[PDB]
Amino acid sequence: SRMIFDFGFHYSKNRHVGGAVSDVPILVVCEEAHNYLPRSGGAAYDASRKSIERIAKEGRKY
Amino acid sequence: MPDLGTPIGSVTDSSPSLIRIEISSAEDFEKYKSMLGVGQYLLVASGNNLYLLASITGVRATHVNFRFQIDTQPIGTLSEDGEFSRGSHSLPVPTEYAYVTPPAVLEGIFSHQIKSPFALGTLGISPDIKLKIDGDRFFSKHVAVVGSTGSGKSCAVAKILQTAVGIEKNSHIVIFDIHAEYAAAFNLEAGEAFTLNLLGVDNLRLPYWLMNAQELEQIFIESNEHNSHNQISQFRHAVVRNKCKHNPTLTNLSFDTPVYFSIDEVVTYLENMNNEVIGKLAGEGKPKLANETLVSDRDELYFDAVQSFIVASQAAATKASNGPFNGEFDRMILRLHTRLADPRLQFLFYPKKEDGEDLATGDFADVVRQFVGYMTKSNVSIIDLSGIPFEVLSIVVSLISRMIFDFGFHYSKNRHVGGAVSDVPILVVCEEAHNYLPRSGGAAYDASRKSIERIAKEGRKYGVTLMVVSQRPSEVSETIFSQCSNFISLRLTNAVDQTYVKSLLPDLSAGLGDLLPNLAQGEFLIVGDAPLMPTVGHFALPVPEPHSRSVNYLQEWNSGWRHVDFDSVIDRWRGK
Amino acid sequence: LIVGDAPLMPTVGHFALPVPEPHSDSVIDRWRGK
Ligand SMILES: Nc1ncnc2c1ncn2[C@@H]1O[C@H](COP(=O)(O)OP(=O)(O)OP(O)(O)=S)[C@@H](O)[C@H]1O
Ligand SMILES: [Mg+2]
């Protein structure tokens, strides 16, 4: 996921410099989320619940 | 005072809390169907040469001939002279008539008894009429808004602000954004002569030494582990001892007092302290380096550059023991090297003046100019926060707020010495508050609440007021509302939200809640002290409108398979 | 509204305002911020 987001970022920068909004959208479909995004869980599952979260708050733009 | 007209019907039940009117003619009801609707007002008799105003709360129609029913509640009293008192002092007897409230009477009551006017739209019954409130009561006190999605909150707020800035007295306003929306609502022709300072992630200047204790402790440290004790102590010691060396003149400094203080130097100090090794030989109760040279005052050398010491040993000739704080501080060093390694956050750690040089202790003044601007003219500023990450948002907000409260108090004192009240008002606008002011939230956002709580309590005396906006008021701070003296309610549907907003708000029986979920697009309800009495109102679209350009998806899918030159993107993607 | 043992009976009253009342460019020359 981190790769996707960083790519969208570095691309939005360029097309914004050009003055045009992005043109390459992406939709990430996630299934059986509760197996890899727990609500009450250990730090062992702290590498995912962070990355994906970055998409929720700062996605629409990029 | 004037000829009210022909009545509607008599009374059939009376009390201080409730009143019940009864109509028995359909031709009479259909004629005045538009006024008798909810929210609007009616006149009742309470003896000769008086009248009583009531607010419609509840209608019912039945067919068994027809029978209507209008439930009402009393607000206040009005004479034939024109005076409008408040507070009920009469129960109306039956066989007393009722009449419908014309506009003319409302306009007459509005004009005279209102000290200073501020327009806030037009009533629904008649568009060619302008609703007014007290000029000073409104913008010198704490407003609030709550609206369901699509209810047109942003446009209404933009209209309010435009009027406050004379767009169709010099006033200062800051508007925090999360969607990049309110920027265009102020993009009139340059010749208008009202300053506009647009800010973002590229041009914002905001050093990190302005922080209070909580923010500094929060960015670079996490106190979850067992090593949470010692880190904080020695961190404080280091930051202080480094604060003076670069600012000698001043006196009696403390952790909180703001002045320049580098951070890389603090990292160097912490590291050099990780690896210390002490000597226990005779008259050598102090450290020992690689070149057999003792040390007297730590602060003199530890900062400059890393140093290496001899190895621990137990020989009677070479007696070297390990240091007190060796080993513990290993992680936070890498964590800090990382955070500083971040490019996207460069505006906070490694900022630059216009010329190119780094900041200095004195530029503090200019740091506030951005928020303040020109003095004798309106200077609405529009901060942007989309580009900012999700972890530093609370910090940014707290700092930008405290920096304003301090200025307010300072100018309030500077004018108290003279004896005249300050003529510089400042408004803060907080949008989508439910993200960074959670009521169910814990310490993850502890730094934000307080920076606003102050304005909730003190701000009024000093000269700065708030304006909160949200769309899910249940998951918002209980304290930030209660200090709000006026409420604007647009459309709300979700039930629990109705319950909460009904509770918090006092003069709301069942009907005033039955009115929220059926309001139209552009309408609103007003409840508080700025009006004489509750009211239902209608707005117009603002000019120019906010757009917040966004990426259209389906209209883009129908296009071609555009060659993403991954090569060029990744190439520019240095990240080195 | 008063409640408890002191009054002869629960009751509501109103308070008269107490006179006296309780109240409490180069401008920013405080870089110290204190
Ligand atoms: N008096 C009015 N007459 C006609 N249309 C109106 C009126 N007031 C508002 N609108 C319409 O409301 C529409 C959208 O409102 P928005 O400004 O998108 O609401 P909002 O503030 O974005 O709420 P969100 O989506 O939760 S951020 C606009 O396209 C307007 O045309
Ligand atoms: Mg909006």
Side-chain angles (χ1 to χ4, degrees):
Chain A
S1 302
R2 174 156 56 71
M3 278 185 283
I4 283 177
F5 165 84
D6 286 325
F7 176 79
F9 188 104
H10 297 297
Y11 197 65
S12 172
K13 288 298 182 64
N14 268 9
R15 278 180 81 87
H16 193 26
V17 168
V21 69
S22 180
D23 282 353
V24 193
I26 310 180
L27 188 65
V28 173
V29 184
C30 296
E31 210 201 2
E32 284 92 19
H34 64 273
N35 198 312
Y36 56 99
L37 283 184
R39 177 173 188 177
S40 45
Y45 287 4
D46 195 7
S48 69
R49 188 169 65 263
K50 289 183 173 176
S51 57
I52 298 305
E53 185 179 1
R54 291 170 66 90
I55 284 170
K57 297 181 171 71
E58 302 175 53
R60 303 189 287 273
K61 268 194 78 186
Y62 309 165
Chain B
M1 189 183 175
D3 49 7
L4 309 192
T6 49
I8 44 181
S10 61
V11 182
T12 55
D13 188 337
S14 171
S15 64
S17 87
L18 186 59
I19 288 173
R20 200 167 299 184
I21 304 165
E22 182 276 302
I23 294 170
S24 65
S25 158
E27 297 176 354
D28 293 28
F29 182 105
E30 272 287 357
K31 208 161 67 188
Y32 304 160
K33 190 179 163 186
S34 304
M35 311 172 172
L36 283 173
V38 180
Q40 304 278 341
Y41 292 87
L42 278 180
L43 291 179
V44 177
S46 177
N48 280 329
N49 300 339
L50 281 181
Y51 284 120
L52 189 153
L53 276 59
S55 178
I56 294 168
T57 174
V59 186
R60 296 179 188 175
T62 61
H63 175 73
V64 176
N65 211 339
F66 298 179
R67 182 66 56 88
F68 288 66
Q69 277 193 5
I70 302 175
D71 291 330
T72 80
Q73 175 192 40
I75 296 91
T77 62
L78 169 80
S79 163
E80 213 72 10
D81 306 67
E83 268 188 59
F84 177 96
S85 63
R86 182 200 296 267
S88 167
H89 43 93
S90 67
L91 291 180
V93 307
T95 68
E96 285 205 74
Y97 281 140
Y99 313 76
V100 181
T101 314
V105 163
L106 289 166
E107 179 177 355
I109 283 167
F110 275 135
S111 58
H112 301 278
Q113 192 181 350
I114 282 179
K115 182 41 58 164
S116 297
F118 181 77
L120 194 146
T122 67
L123 301 160
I125 306 304
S126 159
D128 57 37
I129 296 187
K130 294 186 176 180
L131 183 62
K132 312 190 170 185
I133 42 169
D134 195 354
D136 62 358
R137 293 172 188 246
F138 183 33
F139 291 95
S140 296
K141 288 185 181 176
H142 278 219
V143 193
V145 175
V146 294
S148 170
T149 318
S151 57
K153 323 185 285 289
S154 306
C155 292
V157 173
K159 181 82 151 187
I160 279 178
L161 300 183
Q162 267 183 25
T163 301
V165 300
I167 284 166
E168 291 79 0
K169 172 61 69 171
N170 58 349
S171 58
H172 299 336
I173 174 165
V174 171
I175 305 170
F176 292 156
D177 191 336
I178 289 169
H179 299 288
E181 187 173 1
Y182 290 100
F186 313 80
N187 184 13
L188 298 175
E189 273 63 9
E192 290 295 343
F194 67 102
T195 56
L196 181 55
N197 181 24
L198 178 61
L199 301 178
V201 174
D202 304 326
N203 44 25
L204 174 54
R205 315 203 191 280
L206 185 76
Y208 66 80
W209 52 272
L210 300 179
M211 275 177 243
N212 61 46
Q214 201 163 356
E215 312 205 287
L216 213 55
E217 166 163 332
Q218 195 183 354
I219 302 175
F220 311 153
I221 294 167
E222 315 296 350
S223 56
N224 305 316
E225 302 86 300
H226 184 299
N227 295 322
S228 53
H229 307 278
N230 293 316
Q231 296 174 351
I232 293 163
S233 179
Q234 299 295 343
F235 187 87
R236 292 160 65 64
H237 172 203
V239 187
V240 176
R241 284 302 98 178
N242 173 256
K243 196 179 281 182
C244 300
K245 180 183 179 182
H246 281 240
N247 289 276
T249 73
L250 317 185
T251 54
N252 290 10
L253 289 172
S254 178
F255 186 73
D256 62 58
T257 301
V259 295
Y260 180 91
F261 70 96
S262 176
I263 193 67
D264 296 327
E265 296 179 354
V266 174
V267 177
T268 303
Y269 179 101
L270 266 168
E271 193 187 4
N272 267 338
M273 202 174 171
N274 197 3
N275 315 352
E276 190 178 27
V277 188
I278 305 169
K280 292 202 176 301
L281 304 178
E284 298 206 352
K286 301 190 200 175
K288 176 157 281 149
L289 319 175
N291 71 33
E292 282 74 333
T293 315
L294 305 190
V295 173
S296 316
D297 264 358
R298 289 189 165 73
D299 314 329
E300 301 185 292
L301 181 61
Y302 270 125
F303 284 86
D304 303 358
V306 184
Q307 317 292 357
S308 180
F309 316 92
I310 52 180
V311 188
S313 184
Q314 307 286 46
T318 55
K319 208 71 188 299
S321 158
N322 184 290
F325 297 73
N326 172 267
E328 306 286 72
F329 313 153
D330 67 342
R331 287 197 167 112
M332 78 186 170
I333 313 183
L334 279 299
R335 208 169 290 117
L336 192 158
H337 273 112
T338 294
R339 296 258 191 184
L340 289 179
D342 186 348
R344 188 133 65 88
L345 274 168
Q346 193 173 13
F347 64 72
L348 205 68
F349 301 149
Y350 302 160
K352 317 298 219 182
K353 185 176 288 180
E354 181 48 289
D355 57 52
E357 302 161 40
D358 295 28
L359 278 162
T361 303
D363 306 348
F364 184 97
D366 295 329
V367 166
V368 169
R369 189 63 49 190
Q370 296 169 336
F371 303 106
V372 159
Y374 198 70
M375 180 79 164
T376 72
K377 290 189 177 178
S378 279
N379 64 276
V380 71
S381 282
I382 295 173
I383 308 305
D384 185 347
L385 300 179
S386 70
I388 303 185
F390 81 108
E391 63 205 12
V392 298
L393 182 50
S394 169
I395 300 148
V396 169
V397 173
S398 177
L399 186 61
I400 298 168
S401 301
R402 190 153 48 77
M403 279 193 303
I404 295 163
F405 175 93
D406 184 19
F407 176 113
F409 166 44
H410 205 284
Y411 200 104
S412 84
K413 177 266 287 195
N414 186 314
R415 289 285 64 65
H416 298 147
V417 185
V421 179
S422 179
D423 60 38
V424 168
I426 281 175
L427 183 49
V428 170
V429 171
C430 294
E431 195 191 1
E432 295 282 274
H434 63 289
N435 224 321
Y436 59 98
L437 289 173
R439 190 261 284 167
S440 44
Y445 286 59
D446 195 7
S448 50
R449 309 207 271 250
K450 319 197 177 179
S451 55
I452 285 296
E453 290 197 315
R454 172 161 256 186
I455 298 292
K457 292 149 183 174
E458 289 83 3
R460 187 173 66 255
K461 60 185 289 185
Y462 290 111
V464 173
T465 41
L466 259 181
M467 180 188 277
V468 181
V469 188
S470 186
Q471 85 194 341
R472 187 179 295 172
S474 53
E475 305 185 350
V476 183
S477 158
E478 71 286 10
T479 315
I480 295 173
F481 293 96
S482 64
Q483 304 290 323
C484 271
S485 316
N486 309 334
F487 280 59
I488 300 173
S489 292
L490 300 90
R491 177 146 90 245
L492 296 172
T493 73
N494 212 328
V496 183
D497 302 358
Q498 280 180 24
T499 314
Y500 188 109
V501 179
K502 192 183 290 184
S503 67
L504 177 61
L505 194 62
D507 316 280
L508 263 68
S509 294
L512 288 176
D514 299 358
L515 179 55
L516 287 166
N518 306 335
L519 284 161
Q521 192 143 339
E523 302 189 319
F524 60 76
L525 163 67
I526 191 168
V527 171
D529 312 325
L532 275 295
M533 55 175 182
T535 305
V536 181
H538 185 73
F539 276 151
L541 292 202
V543 181
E545 290 185 303
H547 189 208
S548 76
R549 42 72 167 171
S550 299
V551 180
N552 286 179
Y553 286 53
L554 204 73
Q555 190 157 20
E556 276 292 340
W557 272 347
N558 270 16
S559 57
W561 192 287
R562 196 277 168 172
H563 183 302
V564 177
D565 306 2
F566 281 86
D567 293 336
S568 51
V569 184
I570 184 63
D571 281 8
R572 184 190 160 297
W573 176 354
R574 303 168 181 174
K576 100 187 191 184
Chain C
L1 182 68
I2 187 170
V3 188
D5 300 327
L8 182 50
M9 45 169 200
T11 304
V12 58
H14 81 91
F15 274 108
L17 186 78
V19 177
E21 276 179 296
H23 167 63
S24 187
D25 194 328
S26 71
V27 171
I28 313 293
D29 279 325
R30 289 297 306 286
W31 62 97
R32 177 169 178 174
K34 183 261 279 186

